[PDB]
Design a protein around this ligand. Structure first.
Ligand SMILES: C[C@@H](O)[C@H](N)C(=O)NS(=O)(=O)c1cccc(-c2ccc3n[nH]cc3c2)c1
Ligand SMILES: C[C@@H](O)[C@H](N)C(=O)NS(=O)(=O)c1cccc(-c2ccc3n[nH]cc3c2)c1
Lengths: 402, 395
């Protein structure tokens, strides 16, 4: 259905006229935002990606150097500072190039994979802006791979595999596209043809069917564009793999090669899997219809006292799950039946409802019910925490509590 | 001794003329950056603080409503978009007011504490910019507490406790100042007096010597300001607890008790992650405590026959999950690799020879060159987890 509506109703996020094309993520929405980042970071840690932090604001001269100013000026927020033109970054690459270039580099560091969740700004038109789908502010799960010519093949394979494992945690399939030199391109047509050839070859050595997106490459290189299929039937433009021979020439990037070859230029692969956190929250909100899987759920645990004499104990249980990092709420409202409250928490999409009466208070236990109304019965607080930690850590689908 | 130099030498961060007043954090500096945010996060979870994500650019009308356009205009970066005026946020507070105002509020959800690590920008003069001390872009460990009048006393107590517990982890003492209304403020003098009286009171309920600091308050409220004293004995301004009666009026904020005004407490403890990073880089002279060090373990084989075993050991510490490196370089002696790792500031060097490979152990040398003997991998892992989890200093 509609992410804007669900995000509003579930108290995840909202939009305000004083900041069009940006989003206000309420506590429950920020939890989803951060869990998506943690998910990506945890993959980075097994794949040799290293997170960095960069500026948001740069002198126009940087954008001139990178050719962003020439090709991409329509889309940037510029202002002046002590009589010099500055602009909010729309992409992280040029910053990353300064980082590669900061000190001399050795072949031994390659591939160098720099990741960045920094906030980007693109000046889309007022009337084109919509929800989390077309925006002015976003954070990508961005990274730039700086590598040698001989590493290109393996790194592209690496990107496709990473992308497959990521979307398989959501349960998503995907389709592949090859995007060709646009008009408004940078550098040499013959260099671009090498770049297109290599992407083509990488596409054919990977399993899958692919189509041509004629003329849709970035100004700096051709790309593999990946559309994801959600559980409903919709395709979304999320991921890219972009082969860039042009920026290294622009920034005069070099590394020291095997001794004694001369210095060479690094190759740059731009990539993003989620695309932007914002776009991906949109997609997921609609995909699950608010029925979040446990690790993504900002409603993990509802604690329900049987009656008001078990209130304080319910508060204790709720605090314990809270302190163990779960999104845990409590329903003390005396006006409704136990069964009504269980049903409400279930309609509000809580994964686990923990019922607490006298007998549970006395023994430090909980009576477990799931979202889909499965009864698992009595377990201690600690064992419940332990088992729920596994389900979260492994990012599964929680009809598996046994 | 200077964070800029240490940062350069340790490959933590550097600065560039193309973005004066903003920092480039290399992977090892970015590690430190995030470990600090993580530390604060884990305290938030224990103390009923709820993190949010907000926009960075807002239509100028919001800054007019908040009182920022009249009082902070010059300190802000502004630009036009479709014939309208926008500006990058210098503070999170107005966005939080919008969030609080998004739907009617019940006294039962108060105190409501909104935490935000968003990027702030303020326009400092170029000639006053220095490393991580005076900057244009920064992330504060900011939060705004929305509470009832009769709740102020406990919350400010809580803010004091939060403060002590954090600074105690670093090992810092601190002193307290009261910042009085400045010139060019908003609201009634009378209400201000009322806000100053509550800060005065709580300031000596918390039985600690405190100083007056005339006219240094924010335009929206009086401040408890806090300087910390580091290990070298230098004082730094970091933490602030600000009592705000004005923004609730300005934003027409009410809650259902009938319909009263919330009180806002602005608060930060680290100040900015940037500033605290400068302070910590200098405080230690580059010698990171284990929980903050991005160079926690260096694995060193004794010769090439132990390369594969050293690899396997490093991978186990990496997986466990430490910042674990390895030095396979065949043209440096064992003693040179150890010396190098120690000068690079690794907390522990794990020496791995033929004995160690056979036994599934490690031989450990500390940063300051003390032997800790042969140890099993899993006991060394447990130890280092303790050091990390409890954020241990030099004991
Ligand atoms: C990935 C970054 O490092 C790169 N510097 C960039 O900003 N690229 S991008 O803005 O053009 C970008 C980012 C994310 C997704 C896409 C994109 C664009 C079009 C697509 N069709 N199918 C999948 C698609 C993906 C493009
Ligand atoms: C908490 C937010 O709502 C507030 N808008 C803010 O940004 N505060 S602030 O910019 O004034 C600020 C932030 C961090 C530190 C200080 C500060 C300022 C002066 C000080 N003297 N001694 C300790 C001090 C601390 C001020």
């Amino acid at each position: 259905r509609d992410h804007r509506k669900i995000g509003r109703d579930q108290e995840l996020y909202f939009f305000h006229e004083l900041s069009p094309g940006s989003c206000f993520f309420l506590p429950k929405g920020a939890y989803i935002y951060n869990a998506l980042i943690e998910f990506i970071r945890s993959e980075y840690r097994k794949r040799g990606f290293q997170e960095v932090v960069t500026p948001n604001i740069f002198n126009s001269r940087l954008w001139m150097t990178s050719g962003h100013w020439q090709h991409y000026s329509e889309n940037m927020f510029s202002f002046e500072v002590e009589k010099e033109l500055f602009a909010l970054k729309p992409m992280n690459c040029p910053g990353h190039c300064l980082m590669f270039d900061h000190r001399p580099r050795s072949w031994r560091e390659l591939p160098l994979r720099l990741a960045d969740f920094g906030v980007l700004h693109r000046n889309e038109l007022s009337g084109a802006l919509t929800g989390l789908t077309r925006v002015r502010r976003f954070q990508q799960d961005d990274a730039h791979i700086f590598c040698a010519m001989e590493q290109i093949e393996d790194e592209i394979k690496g990107c496709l595999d990473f992308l497959r494992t990521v979307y398989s945690v959501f349960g998503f399939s995907f389709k592949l596209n090859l995007s060709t030199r646009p008009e408004k391109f940078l550098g040499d047509i013959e260099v671009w043809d090498q770049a297109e050839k290599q992407l083509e070859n990488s596409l054919n050595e990977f399993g899958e069917k692919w189509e041509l997106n004629s003329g849709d490459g970035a100004f700096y290189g051709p790309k593999i564009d990946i559309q994801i299929k959600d559980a409903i039937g919709r395709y979304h433009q999320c991921a890219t793999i972009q082969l860039d021979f042009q920026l290294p020439i622009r920034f005069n990037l070099t590394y020291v090669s095997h001794d004694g070859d001369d210095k060479k230029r690094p190759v740059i692969v731009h990539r993003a899997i989620l695309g932007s956190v914002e776009r991906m929250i949109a997609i997921l909100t609609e995909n699950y219809g608010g029925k979040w899987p446990f690790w993504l759920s900002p409603r993990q645990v509802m604690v329900v006292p049987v009656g008001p004499t078990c209130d304080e104990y319910a508060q204790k249980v709720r605090q314990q799950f809270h302190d163990a990092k779960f999104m845990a709420d409590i329903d003390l409202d005396p006006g409704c039946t136990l069964n009504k409250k269980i049903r409400n928490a279930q309609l509000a999409q809580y994964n686990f409802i923990l019922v607490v009466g006298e007998k549970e208070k006395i023994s430090g236990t909980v009576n477990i019910r799931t979202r889909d109304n499965k009864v698992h019965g009595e377990r201690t607080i600690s064992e419940t925490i332990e088992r729920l930690q596994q389900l979260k850590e492994f990012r599964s689908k929680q009809a598996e509590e046994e």
